Write a protein that binds this ligand. Structure first.
Ligand code: CA
Ligand code: CA
Ligand code: CA
Ligand code: CA
Lengths: 146, 15
């Protein structure tokens, strides 16, 4: 029951990291993405991140190893502390609502080239109440519900 | 209608 939709989504996420498109994610590529989000992982942390999933021992992450990384993380995310941390990454002005403009800004900072329509689509997918924004409860639902 | 969950998880990868 893996869908074509889920695969395309994983593919988009992989390509966010794989900025040179060589089909592998290196420590440098992980470092660049986490730094674009205001984090500062050390070389050792980056190596440990790859090591957790590096099935062939080659020092980089390929597609199925990236899928493994994501699946582990989905399973590991129930804590309000982790989810609230992710929420604040997107709720730039801290007003408790992720707007289409805030999501556009974060996507741009990540290097993801998305149309205005694609960003509105993302807000619509997570918006439950229909106010046109994403509140914390809606963000939780998006993260824990699948 | 476009699921964004994988992006929202990225800040949590560091765990
Ligand atoms: Ca690469
Ligand atoms: Ca590998
Ligand atoms: Ca906001
Ligand atoms: Ca809403």
């Amino acid at each position: 029951q893996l869908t074509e939709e889920q695969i395309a989504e994983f593919k988009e996420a992989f390509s966010l990291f794989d900025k040179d498109g060589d089909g592998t994610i290196t420590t440098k590529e992980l470092g660049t993405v986490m730094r674009s989000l205001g984090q500062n992982p050390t070389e050792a942390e980056l190596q440990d991140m790859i090591n957790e999933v590096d099935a062939d021992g080659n020092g980089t992450i390929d597609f199925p190893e990236f899928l493994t990384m994501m699946a582990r993380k989905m399973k590991d995310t129930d804590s309000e502390e982790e989810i609230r941390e992710a929420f604040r990454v997107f709720d730039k002005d801290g007003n408790g609502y992720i707007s289409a403009a805030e999501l556009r800004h974060v996507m741009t900072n990540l290097g993801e080239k998305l149309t205005d329509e694609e960003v509105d689509e993302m807000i619509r997918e997570a918006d439950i109440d229909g106010d046109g924004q994403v509140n914390y409860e809606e963000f939780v639902q998006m993260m824990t519900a699948k | 209608g476009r699921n964004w969950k994988n992006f929202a998880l990225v800040p949590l990868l560091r765990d």
